[PDB]
Design an enzyme around this catalytic site. Structure first.
Site, PDB file in Angstrom:
ATOM      1  CD  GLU A  32      -2.016  -1.000   2.984  1.00  0.00           C
ATOM      2  OE1 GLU A  32      -2.825  -2.175   3.625  1.00  0.00           O
ATOM      3  OE2 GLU A  32      -1.874   0.426   3.520  1.00  0.00           O
ATOM      4  CG  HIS A  60      -4.220   0.042   6.769  1.00  0.00           C
ATOM      5  ND1 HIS A  60      -2.841  -0.319   6.281  1.00  0.00           N
ATOM      6  CD2 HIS A  60      -4.716  -0.393   7.715  1.00  0.00           C
ATOM      7  CE1 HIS A  60      -2.094  -0.644   7.479  1.00  0.00           C
ATOM      8  NE2 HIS A  60      -3.438  -0.935   7.893  1.00  0.00           N
TER       9      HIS A  60
END
Lengths: 526, 106, 526, 208
Positions: free
Chosen positions: A259, A277
């Protein structure tokens, strides 16, 4: 009056726990020029994640005592650097558990019911009610992989839906599981048996990419799987393969192998719910991070114990006792590895000259060792009181004047639930104070506690050492040091080798077959 | 019901869509924790009572409005009975359900 | 300002722990007329053993809150009476452990070396050095029967003589033993294997006269045996028989089946060292008793928790929660009995209406149940924190709104070290609030929790109930209530009977054979 | 009067001398015995004699003939006592220097209830082996297969290994090894082993 520099977006209410004994100021942390100017008279530094507390920062901050992270992560902090400057690092390790378990649950329901797609469908202006079909939870089995705090939370919540819970976690004691009313299974049995799997492992080479193509293929057809925990615990590509093939019904990822994540093929599959997230994006979870971290800073400035502490720093440790932290950590591991199952308790025993020191940290080190497999790197200390409650393993110290052979030796006795004991001993000696493992279960010797160590407990016949050495030589792996002897009595003998690299799997196996190993392990002592 | 309550609380569909569109809008979302919060259930048919029991496990307190429900049953469900007024004042979440008497509801 | 009446020989220094918040006075306790006159305005009463705190006393003392015993024993106190008047009884349970272990050790050495006889020999004026022959300890095995505090103390001391220690105690968890570095054996194996035996059991029908003629005959020839613990733990007559026959080399009694003891034939044997119950005659042990008991009285008058508490009294317990103490105690027992080994932990679960109460005492009750076998009578509460450290078993409570069937039910889950669980449930209901066991391991029913209950887990064939009933009928034993059903699945079924008396041994055995019992137990639920 | 605290050391130090000798290629010109630790408090002169004693048993086909035997072969003894031992509570170091100048060191200790004589250093590599039974020492070229070949050849000779320890050397391209065998190595096997690992030095000595 002590100065507390808050360098990230943290409300003063959010930190009212720092009594009125301190002068609290803010700075724009992600502004290097401003930060560096601000830190010089800070006794304490609170940060969130935008500020990077760097080598440069710490050197700019010579009065510093506590850098505190309002959060669980540490990636914005160079601990090793703070450790070497005597600056105590702390975080908020249990501030996000509720928000994260709730998110896991959210993802689980959201995915079983194809919510965002339904919601998306009414957003386009179509009544496509006939196309949906969700999965009911009552009476289904839920597999929780990793039974730490969050997993035990998810387990309580899901259980109230009338699901059966089972879990995989070799680092929760069987009694502890049973108290939680959970059945402990091999990851094989969970896989086969679960209708839902939510994963809850930290990220460790032990762990990364657990649920691979091979694992997904053992799962019940119709499984719904949810990873709100870490990074790439479940293999994104193999998941995409199984969704498409239909074998797994749905998924929900909160986290991504890498990410920021924008381009996964997972975003093309419908039956997979995804969120950037979010597990801890909750005003409640951020305030908790702050209030917690405030309290730690308070304790830290009163010179009280700091249980949330991540490392060691300040006179919290004698120079004479200092070098023993790492080694005892290593015994901890080893004692873990040489045990059949997870010890119900560690008995750290300190003998000889060292017994004159404050050595209570060494008990923390042993635990930190034993649980290396589920502990992320920067963390060096851990909460013993918390560890016990969560996983059900404890540790104690015993001092003794006399050390039979070396002047100081530390013995770690892992005790098994059934009353059996594994013992591993080390010392330090010499101008370099190098770490040596000097006893394993009655066997005395002297091996550098470093590198990749292979340990074998095989059947004692002539040329077994031959077979072992020759197999290794063929794998092209060099042996730096070796040690073997007796087994107490009976058949079996015990070898230990420092190698220059890992023993690959087929080779590791071949050895077990050639000496007819009972047990064969490989442990990195660094 | 529980699903929608969590979807709405964590903005799941909006979040998921952000990724569908290939944006990392992590910094754009901010949800609500259920833990320790008070949940109002309005109406206590079997479903409302089931929902009361599922939410209690998130560690929320459950109050509910339903004057035809066995008070005993409500205390066995871990529920504090209230007037619709008081529930409305104290609820951080509210989930509304068929009552015990079908269409005493308004 | 509160009044503390000290009615026995206890120094004011010895009780300086009662801060200056109280007015402390003395009275000549063993003088009834004086005592009775003195007690009326006492908030607190300290006694040693000369004063008898009687039914009469308590009734004379209407302001009373704490009767405290500076000591371990309670024979000079009628607790049940104090309980019924709301008066908290307390003692000093751990004040004599050091003096008593030391005495055990004294007796052990004194006996192995024929000290008083040697000393006596120089007192008559003869050099009879050639006649003596003592027994060396280094390298010998020492058997400790009963591993409570004193036994663990004796075990540490004797170990430093380079003896090996082994112990018998089904009420210490195997892990706890192993932490102490002690090997746990059947009393059979200890007997065979020990060169020295020191005994450390409380006195309970479970226990009285353990080491009988039959037990002594399994002991190693040359054994030296020492009982500094209780009353008649080792059979005086059978000991005399074995000393004389030479099979046991020596002994040391500190305590006597019936004391005052003046006329035993043991006093005629030389090789047996004897002392008039001295284990705790130590100025250090008496002062400790006092200082401890002072501290408890302080806590008790501040309305703080009183862990040394022997019973319940004062608002320390709700009327609604009160009647559940006894019953939960009974589940505790039962859960103990139905377990294969000693549980590593009790999980007391409280469901339904009762969950609204303060029910933390109920956790204490469960433990008090489980350990009935090594707990003397008057004691109703016990120290959970202390229990855990000593024996290694813990207890916790969990409340739940919903009770599936009864309005309130308490479930006791004994968890095994290996992860297995036994569950036993009771409730109270009705105008009399009678105690009923209502579940054992998934089996629901309704049996009065009273009397002598036989439990059998045998093989489910037709007429097994016949065999059982008919055998009992022949033993002339009446059945008051019975219950049987299924085993989860498989072979085996489970019966439970209230009887009007004990099942004698041969009969108990015959039944096991006739239904081919797996397990067969008998438990007094009163 | 040899002190009760020293007596157990005699036999062990004798052993240390057998090692110092069998290990020097040239006969040595000096033998140096260094006591370090708690033993230094005692009178340990008799330990020198023990060392000289093993040293000459291991080269020449009593406790007072020895000192005069030594001088007849130019070997000069020395003994040292220092309180400081940096690892063991007590340890004796026997040290033999050659005419040319080459050094060999061997060290022992006793500890535990059965005060077991253990060997502990061979040239600055640490070990913990019982100073008993037939031991084979090898100083050879450190490379992959080395351990394999040593074992395979011993196995093949039907020779069983009881215990063993090896370590890579401080700075050389070599490595050392110590094995306790259940029986002696026929000479050919010794030679086959030597050739196989490029042994700089091989020896078998019997520490009964």
């Amino acid at each position: 009056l002590p100065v507390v520099l808050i360098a990230d977006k943290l409300a003063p209410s959010t930190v009212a726990a720092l009594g009125d004994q301190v002068e609290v100021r803010w700075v724009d942390g992600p502004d290097r020029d401003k930060l560096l100017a601000a830190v010089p008279e800070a006794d304490a530094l609170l940060v969130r994640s935008a500020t990077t507390v760097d080598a440069e920062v710490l050197a700019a901050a010579p009065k510093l005592k506590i850098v505190a992270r309002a959060g669980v992560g540490l990636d914005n902090v160079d601990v090793d650097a703070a450790t070497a400057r005597g600056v105590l690092v702390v975080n908020a390790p249990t501030s996000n558990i509720h928000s994260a378990a709730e998110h896991a649950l959210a993802l689980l329901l959201a995915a079983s019911r194809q919510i965002p797609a339904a919601d998306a469908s009414l957003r386009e202006h179509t009544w496509k009610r006939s196309s949906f079909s969700g999965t009911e939870i009552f009476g289904k089995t839920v597999g929780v992989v990793g039974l730490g705090r969050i997993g035990q939370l998810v387990a309580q919540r899901i259980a109230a839906f009338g699901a059966y819970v089972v879990a995989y976690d070799p680092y929760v004691s069987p009694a502890r599981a049973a108290q939680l009313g959970i059945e402990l299974l091999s990851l094989d049995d969970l896989l086969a048996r679960a209708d839902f799997i939510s994963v809850h492992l930290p990220k460790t080479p032990e762990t990364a990419g657990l649920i691979d193509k091979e694992a997904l293929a053992k799962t019940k057809p119709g499984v719904i799987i949810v990873n709100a925990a870490r990074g790439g615990l479940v293999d994104e590509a193999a998941l995409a393969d199984a969704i498409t093939g239909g074998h797994v019904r749905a998924a929900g990822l909160d986290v991504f192998a890498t990410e920021p994540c924008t381009d996964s093929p997972l975003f093309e599959l419908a039956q997979v719910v995804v969120t950037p997230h979010l597990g801890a994006s909750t005003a409640e979870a951020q305030d908790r991070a702050g209030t917690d971290v405030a309290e730690s800073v308070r304790l830290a400035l009163a010179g009280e114990f700091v249980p949330d502490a991540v490392n060691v720093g300040g006179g919290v440790v004698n120079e004479e006792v200092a070098p023993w932290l790492d080694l005892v950590r290593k015994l901890g591991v080893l004692a873990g590895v040489l045990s059949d199952e997870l010890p119900v308790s560690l008995s750290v025993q300190v003998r000889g000259e060292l017994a004159a020191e404050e050595v209570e940290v060494l008990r923390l080190s042993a635990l930190r060792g034993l649980f290396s497999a589920v502990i992320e790197d920067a963390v060096t200390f851990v909460n013993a009181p918390a560890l016990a409650a969560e996983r059900g393993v404890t540790a104690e110290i015993c001092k003794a004047s006399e050390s039979p052979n070396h002047r100081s030796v530390v013995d770690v006795r892992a005790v098994g639930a059934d009353g059996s004991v594994v013992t591993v001993s080390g010392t330090l000696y010499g101008p370099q104070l190098s770490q040596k493992i000097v006893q394993i279960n009655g066997r005395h010797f002297d091996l550098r506690a470093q590198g990749i160590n292979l340990i074998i407990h095989y059947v004692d016949r002539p040329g077994a050492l031959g077979k072992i050495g020759t197999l290794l030589g063929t794998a092209g792996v060099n042996i730096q040091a070796a040690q073997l002897s007796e087994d107490a009595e009976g058949p079996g003998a015990t070898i230990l080798l420092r190698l220059d690299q890992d023993v690959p799997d087929d080779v590791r196996t071949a050895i077990a077959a050639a000496v007819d190993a009972y047990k064969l392990e490989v442990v990195d002592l660094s």
